[PDB]
Amino acid sequence: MKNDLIRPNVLSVKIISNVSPEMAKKLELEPHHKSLGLITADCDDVTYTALDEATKAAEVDVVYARSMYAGAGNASTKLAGEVIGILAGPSPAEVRSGLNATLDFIDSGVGFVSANEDDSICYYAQCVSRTGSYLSKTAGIREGEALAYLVAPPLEAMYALDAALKAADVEMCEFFAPPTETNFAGALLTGSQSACKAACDAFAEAVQSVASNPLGF
């Protein structure tokens, strides 16, 4: 139903101790990256937010983060979901600490939200109050600054991004042009925490507006 949280689910997690040099090379790891933490889940942008959160209190870097074509509902295998993320760290223990923070965040109540009665339209309107090292890098902002992380299906997202930019004192940092691999779209916008919150609220309202009257015209 409208405003229901879509629960995100972790599907697989593994640690690699002593990654092989060939893989370190293809993954373009830094010399001090000895261990990898691998994770897949059925919701990509939640997982991206969670990996970024893990970087704040552990010595891990997000070295790989990709979404699957056509999303988790079209996955052909059980563990592919719609995202793969890889953390790299100095040891299996520090990687485990990052993975633990990732899982905790994924289960913290964050998630996409339904915009209508049968949950056939959903969006992500997440106020990242202080970025870690991953989203700060991708958005081009300093670690510790705020983002609105806004995602919705393509038309909803273009419409609602415009609404969010008009409603709030925020800047466009990164545009997820439609389609992403999952056939969504959105952006990372930056500003103060209150401005990012105002952008999240406006984005959510606008997606719901489209959902209620898609063909108004």
Added chain:
Amino acid sequence: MKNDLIRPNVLSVKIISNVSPEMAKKLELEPHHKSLGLITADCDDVTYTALDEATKAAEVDVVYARSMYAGAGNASTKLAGEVIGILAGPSPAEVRSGLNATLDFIDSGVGFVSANEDDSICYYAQCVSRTGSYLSKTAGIREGEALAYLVAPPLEAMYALDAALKAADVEMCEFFAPPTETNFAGALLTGSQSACKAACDAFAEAVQSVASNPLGFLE
């Protein structure tokens, strides 16, 4: 069955009367582009043709147009379909005129056509007599020149494209290498108006002949 029209459907439409400067920049709007029209539908190449037509009937430009991975039948949300298009214009009235022209074209009888009994093979063989500003730029030809707009699933398309090029005095302007995002293939071909139509007819017949005998010499 064979030759049945696959009806295209519009799923959502919206106008933005005056776009935020931030979005105007990311969408690379022209300075006089104040307003946007957004549309999604369940058939990408028909929508691209329709948007091109809108640039002829109203003072609008196609500023964004992309297809969705694995097509409308695999859409995970209600309005994603398999295409998003964005028209930009000087005011909401011109954008509204462009969107109306787009919707009119989509319901005009143009569409993909079935090639077999259960409609599991389909193709597009559309002769654009006079391109607007969108398909001309996509093909690299002058606005107003003609196009054969040919799309089919990968093997059918490669076979039928080769057949069309032999059948008519046309040149390949843009190759849609398999897979497109929707797992189709095809091309935009140009030439005189009669040659583009001759190519369309040849493309259609060639797709049909594969569809009628998918394993070729293996029976």
Added chain:
Amino acid sequence: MKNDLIRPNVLSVKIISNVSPEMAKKLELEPHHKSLGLITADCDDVTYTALDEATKAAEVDVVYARSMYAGAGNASTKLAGEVIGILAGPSPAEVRSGLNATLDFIDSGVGFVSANEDDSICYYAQCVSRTGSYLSKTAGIREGEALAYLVAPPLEAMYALDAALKAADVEMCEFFAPPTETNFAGALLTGSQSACKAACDAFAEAVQSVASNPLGF
């Protein structure tokens, strides 16, 4: 069920005589290749192996080979499957021989292997004892050298590639970074035949270990 072969299927085959100059140019055909053989199937990496085998038994080159977004299970038309391949040869006779050799290999008992009861996790761990001209070119090795052709879903593949590289005297030749169009991943590894075999065995065991305990870390 676990260790079942997943049967691959050919969906469409067609021969062209005297390809158009325009299509010959776009496919970068050799001047004397006047004939094309088109094939589609529902399993991409098996078909890529089969096309490479065809180049050993007939005077054909692989000139096109691509996978479809989201795999055969999500195909929207009857003949798209998840792969298109194109063989080129001097005449329909050579192309016909190559297509027959491709079909015979696809029907030879090669295939992805199931890792669980409902065949919702599967992997490919194929030792190519003697490459043809297609996979040797893709891997950057001399024609006739051996390959381990290793494919699995994204997390399984990264984990199991690391296991394969550690288990045998092999080098990574080509990395299929997740996602491929079909939302798989893997690599081509080379070495001696026994080392490629050792890599395949290690890859298969590692994929199975993830399938048996996906969330244990």
